């Protein structure tokens, strides 16, 4: 059997404003943003027991996604990180531990990227923190192609919105979509976000990427009453759970804009990471 699907586009009415959600949270055990970024690696056919080296937060969505990617394919994941809290060691990190990730701690408190790169032997594959690399663009070429087909099937000319951390996903979706892509800076400000994108691709053309501001300054990973309420409303009334770190801010901004085209909101997935944020709520 050959079977293929693409994530569906779902219609939602929020206080009379009808818009569309690209349900990338339904892509599978690996879903959402990091599933799109992993498309390049999933399409490769690496030798058995291939080793992968990455780094970043011990509770990060990328860690969780990479651990599943490696476990499904009998690859190995080496994950460098800052010296982990004693409390956390004894008590996404749990899922990565269960998937057999080889954690290597930055005992000498050095530059975590340099530390990680140094562990990368010949024949190992290095994957930048958060998969914030050029390889990540192929999954967003794929996402752009899916949206191209689905937009035509609906005869809708969309404006697309997705929230940013490093801006990698939004930059590459805007690179390949015919539709205008809108984003927001969940980490830092818009100046910082442009700087990250230009570090990723110094030749990047911002002609198809627009940046929206929130009318309130929200600090990354801090809890906000209005975010919890929106999260719970979307969960209880629509059975759609969103990530509380990026997507709930992104939705909050998108829902305050006046859109001149139908809006397609890209679900970022990562709801298994909500364990940590919900504790703060």
mmCIF file of N, CA, C and O in Angstrom, residues 15 32 40-42 45 50 57 75-76 138 141 164 190 195 218 222 234 249:
data_model
loop_
_atom_site.group_PDB
_atom_site.id
_atom_site.type_symbol
_atom_site.label_atom_id
_atom_site.label_comp_id
_atom_site.label_asym_id
_atom_site.label_seq_id
_atom_site.Cartn_x
_atom_site.Cartn_y
_atom_site.Cartn_z
ATOM 1 N N UNK A 15 -15.632 34.835 17.624
ATOM 2 C CA UNK A 15 -16.394 36.068 17.870
ATOM 3 C C UNK A 15 -16.847 36.716 16.568
ATOM 4 O O UNK A 15 -16.856 37.942 16.429
ATOM 5 N N UNK A 32 3.845 19.524 13.797
ATOM 6 C CA UNK A 32 4.026 20.951 13.960
ATOM 7 C C UNK A 32 5.324 21.452 13.343
ATOM 8 O O UNK A 32 5.888 20.866 12.406
ATOM 9 N N UNK A 40 13.709 17.487 5.725
ATOM 10 C CA UNK A 40 14.950 17.152 5.028
ATOM 11 C C UNK A 40 15.549 15.852 5.554
ATOM 12 O O UNK A 40 15.948 14.978 4.780
ATOM 13 N N UNK A 41 15.639 15.724 6.875
ATOM 14 C CA UNK A 41 16.295 14.565 7.470
ATOM 15 C C UNK A 41 15.453 13.305 7.332
ATOM 16 O O UNK A 41 15.993 12.201 7.203
ATOM 17 N N UNK A 42 14.128 13.450 7.369
ATOM 18 C CA UNK A 42 13.239 12.301 7.222
ATOM 19 C C UNK A 42 13.315 11.737 5.810
ATOM 20 O O UNK A 42 13.202 10.520 5.614
ATOM 21 N N UNK A 45 18.080 8.858 3.560
ATOM 22 C CA UNK A 45 18.177 7.456 3.963
ATOM 23 C C UNK A 45 19.601 7.272 4.460
ATOM 24 O O UNK A 45 20.514 6.990 3.681
ATOM 25 N N UNK A 50 23.143 5.652 12.301
ATOM 26 C CA UNK A 50 23.690 6.987 12.093
ATOM 27 C C UNK A 50 23.530 7.837 13.349
ATOM 28 O O UNK A 50 22.479 7.831 13.992
ATOM 29 N N UNK A 57 18.090 23.664 24.762
ATOM 30 C CA UNK A 57 17.479 23.499 26.068
ATOM 31 C C UNK A 57 17.090 22.055 26.322
ATOM 32 O O UNK A 57 16.600 21.354 25.434
ATOM 33 N N UNK A 75 18.366 5.525 14.636
ATOM 34 C CA UNK A 75 19.501 6.428 14.679
ATOM 35 C C UNK A 75 19.842 6.745 16.136
ATOM 36 O O UNK A 75 19.101 6.409 17.064
ATOM 37 N N UNK A 76 20.979 7.399 16.341
ATOM 38 C CA UNK A 76 21.378 7.837 17.669
ATOM 39 C C UNK A 76 21.376 9.358 17.727
ATOM 40 O O UNK A 76 21.776 10.021 16.764
ATOM 41 N N UNK A 138 13.433 22.863 3.583
ATOM 42 C CA UNK A 138 12.773 21.943 2.662
ATOM 43 C C UNK A 138 11.385 21.562 3.153
ATOM 44 O O UNK A 138 10.454 21.431 2.338
ATOM 45 N N UNK A 141 9.290 24.485 2.080
ATOM 46 C CA UNK A 141 8.921 24.330 0.672
ATOM 47 C C UNK A 141 7.741 23.372 0.539
ATOM 48 O O UNK A 141 6.759 23.656 -0.169
ATOM 49 N N UNK A 164 7.030 33.467 15.525
ATOM 50 C CA UNK A 164 8.465 33.212 15.402
ATOM 51 C C UNK A 164 9.181 33.178 16.745
ATOM 52 O O UNK A 164 8.842 33.910 17.678
ATOM 53 N N UNK A 190 11.262 42.785 17.046
ATOM 54 C CA UNK A 190 11.299 42.577 15.604
ATOM 55 C C UNK A 190 12.699 42.846 15.061
ATOM 56 O O UNK A 190 13.166 42.142 14.159
ATOM 57 N N UNK A 195 17.463 40.282 12.687
ATOM 58 C CA UNK A 195 18.887 39.980 12.818
ATOM 59 C C UNK A 195 19.140 38.474 12.785
ATOM 60 O O UNK A 195 20.077 38.011 12.123
ATOM 61 N N UNK A 218 4.701 41.325 25.758
ATOM 62 C CA UNK A 218 4.639 40.040 26.436
ATOM 63 C C UNK A 218 6.052 39.494 26.552
ATOM 64 O O UNK A 218 6.809 39.503 25.576
ATOM 65 N N UNK A 222 6.637 33.827 30.206
ATOM 66 C CA UNK A 222 5.914 34.217 31.412
ATOM 67 C C UNK A 222 4.424 33.955 31.231
ATOM 68 O O UNK A 222 3.891 34.144 30.128
ATOM 69 N N UNK A 234 -10.025 27.675 23.337
ATOM 70 C CA UNK A 234 -9.789 26.932 22.102
ATOM 71 C C UNK A 234 -9.842 25.432 22.355
ATOM 72 O O UNK A 234 -10.377 24.673 21.539
ATOM 73 N N UNK A 249 0.412 33.393 21.952
ATOM 74 C CA UNK A 249 0.744 34.780 21.616
ATOM 75 C C UNK A 249 0.457 35.069 20.147
ATOM 76 O O UNK A 249 -0.122 36.107 19.802
#
